[PDB]
Design a protein around this ligand. Structure first.
Ligand SMILES: CCS(=O)(=O)Nc1ccc(Oc2ccc(F)cc2F)c(-c2cn(C)c(=O)c3cc(-c4cnc(C5CCC5)[nH]4)oc23)c1
Length: 112
């Protein structure tokens, strides 16, 4: 259960993404997209591999990530699903972008 130095960094990023500091734009990402509740027609046809922060959290807490690139691929998938489904002017796309800017900058500062 001991994380590598790179995955400890990633755990730090995840905790920041889930923190009150980012909650104004992170909240739509805290749990899987409920397509039924939202009426997102054909969400699960268009999005083959759903992802959200609760999923990333589970993988990290269970020590299931093999490396940092796996973590980054999941977080990027979460954002790319959002951009792929939604129109460019939707509020959730703006929120995704704000959260992704936090992620990309912090991830880039991972010790190599
Ligand atoms: C906490 C997870 S949840 O149980 O599914 N709750 C939830 C609540 C609000 C969500 O997004 C919104 C953001 C802003 C807004 F004004 C409305 C939202 F539905 C979203 C939401 C998250 N993600 C990742 C998305 O990609 C989308 C897309 C949409 C969405 C809602 N209405 C549309 C339009 C029809 C296509 C554009 N898209 O809502 C979410 C989810």
């Amino acid at each position: 259960g001991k994380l590598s130095e790179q995955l400890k960094h990633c755990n730090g990023i995840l905790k920041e993404l889930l923190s009150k500091k980012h909650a104004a734009y992170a909240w739509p990402f805290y749990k899987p997209v409920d397509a039924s509740a939202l009426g997102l027609h054909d969400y699960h046809d268009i999005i083959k591999h759903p992802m959200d922060l609760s999923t990333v959290k589970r993988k990290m807490e269970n020590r299931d990530y093999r490396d940092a690139q796996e973590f980054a691929a999941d977080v990027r998938l979460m954002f790319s699903n959002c951009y792929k489904y939604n129109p460019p002017d939707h509020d959730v796309v703006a929120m995704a972008r704000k959260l992704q800017d936090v992620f990309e900058f912090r991830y880039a500062k991972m010790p190599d």
